[PDB]
Amino acid sequence: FHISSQQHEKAIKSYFDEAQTQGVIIIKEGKNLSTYGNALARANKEYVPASTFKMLNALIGLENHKATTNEIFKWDGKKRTYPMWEKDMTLGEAMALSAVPVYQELARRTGLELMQKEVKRVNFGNTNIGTQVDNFWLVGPLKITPVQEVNFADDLAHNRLPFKLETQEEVKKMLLIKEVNGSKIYAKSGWGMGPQVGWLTGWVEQANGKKIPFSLNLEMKEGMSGSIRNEITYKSLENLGII
Ligand SMILES: *C(=O)N1C[C@H](NOS(=O)(=O)O)CC[C@H]1C(N)=O
């Protein structure tokens, strides 16, 4: 509808302003990155990946045969932080529910060494996982920037990461979170509770098959629900005509 750039920029900054946080949303068309939001300098700062790490955690586990996509991870019967986690699930269900115990299990099956080696080989963030195989993505030392996250999403959306095509297709089928008038949104959220960072990193796949990667990165505040990350992302992507 021939909207100015100034006006797209202003509408998107105001989504972040109206949520009373600081954040950025990076979009990639082709090789070109565009940063929007109310705190542009966040784009190249380092944050914990938190649960966005599940995406690489799954790739690595599936590649190295530590799980299959059919395999049921049994709830062991301990009280878990949310009721939705007190059930048996597949890697894919666990991705939708962001179920830490399943992903911690998978990380322990991979083991620190194969994990350190594979995070180096795919060159994710600062690539340092420290000595603790089951929490490194939440409290350090692993860190990543919003630009590295959209680049990561871009790689995965186009099967360019160093993993078999089928492993990549298996993890991607797990990430479908929304369908809007012929578009599909694939993404993983993240919330570094261990200032708390919030992510939503992914791509939109358009009707015509074109794929536009994005990473939202913002500060999660006291009593904000996780779903603002989705609301701000849907509003930004629509404003830009991407969905
Ligand atoms: C991931 O960053 N986490 C796992 C779980 N679900 O997260 S989501 O809403 O960000 O998708 C709870 C919180 C968080 C964590 N503390 O590990």
Side-chain angles (χ1 to χ4, degrees), residues 1-17 19-30 32-172 174-221 223-243:
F1 153 49
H2 313 83
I3 281 152
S4 62
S5 194
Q6 171 181 77
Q7 181 190 331
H8 283 125
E9 295 173 41
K10 173 192 209 200
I12 296 163
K13 164 176 187 287
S14 78
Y15 305 146
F16 288 86
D17 286 330
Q20 277 169 353
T21 187
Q22 307 87 237
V24 79
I25 182 170
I26 308 176
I27 309 272
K28 210 176 154 164
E29 285 139 3
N32 182 226
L33 299 166
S34 307
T35 307
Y36 298 99
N38 74 354
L40 296 193
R42 290 178 73 95
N44 284 108
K45 295 181 184 302
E46 279 189 345
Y47 299 102
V48 301
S51 305
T52 64
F53 190 71
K54 295 200 186 17
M55 286 190 285
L56 180 53
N57 193 348
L59 263 353
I60 290 180
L62 284 171
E63 271 268 320
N64 297 273
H65 305 102
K66 309 301 172 160
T68 64
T69 63
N70 305 294
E71 159 167 13
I72 288 149
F73 289 78
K74 294 303 203 278
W75 171 42
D76 61 347
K78 290 130 120 310
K79 171 102 212 66
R80 280 183 194 166
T81 318
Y82 314 67
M84 26 149 210
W85 299 349
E86 304 171 347
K87 82 174 208 63
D88 311 328
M89 50 197 116
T90 62
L91 250 22
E93 289 152 350
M95 189 67 75
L97 293 166
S98 206
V100 169
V102 169
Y103 279 86
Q104 287 187 284
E105 166 61 9
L106 186 66
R108 297 182 180 107
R109 291 180 190 186
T110 299
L112 183 61
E113 154 163 8
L114 209 202
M115 187 68 89
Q116 178 58 86
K117 169 276 183 188
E118 286 280 89
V119 175
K120 227 103 215 154
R121 191 168 63 71
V122 329
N123 175 28
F124 185 84
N126 71 8
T127 74
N128 179 28
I129 78 177
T131 59
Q132 304 261 282
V133 77
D134 54 44
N135 79 139
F136 67 77
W137 53 77
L138 197 41
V139 299
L142 188 64
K143 302 252 171 87
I144 191 161
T145 65
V147 159
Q148 284 163 343
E149 284 237 342
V150 238
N151 282 341
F152 176 87
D154 184 45
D155 285 347
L156 179 64
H158 296 90
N159 306 317
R160 315 197 201 100
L161 301 156
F163 295 111
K164 296 180 198 213
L165 172 64
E166 42 120 311
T167 309
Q168 289 181 83
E169 293 302 352
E170 275 175 351
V171 180
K172 301 198 272 166
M174 308 183 181
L175 302 164
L176 175 58
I177 59 175
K178 180 72 168 215
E179 266 167 277
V180 204
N181 307 122
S183 294
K184 291 187 221 260
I185 304 172
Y186 293 89
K188 184 62 188 93
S189 59
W191 191 333
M193 277 141 160
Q196 284 173 343
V197 63
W199 294 99
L200 177 62
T201 293
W203 61 97
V204 4
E205 181 185 335
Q206 305 188 298
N208 46 77
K210 199 214 173 92
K211 282 168 291 200
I212 299 126
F214 65 82
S215 181
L216 167 287
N217 171 283
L218 87 205
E219 203 129 302
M220 298 293 289
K221 306 291 189 215
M224 186 152 299
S225 37
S227 91
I228 24 99
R229 295 165 302 177
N230 304 69
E231 296 171 41
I232 286 164
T233 292
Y234 311 157
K235 287 207 266 138
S236 292
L237 256 9
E238 193 179 50
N239 175 274
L240 295 173
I242 302 176
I243 62 187

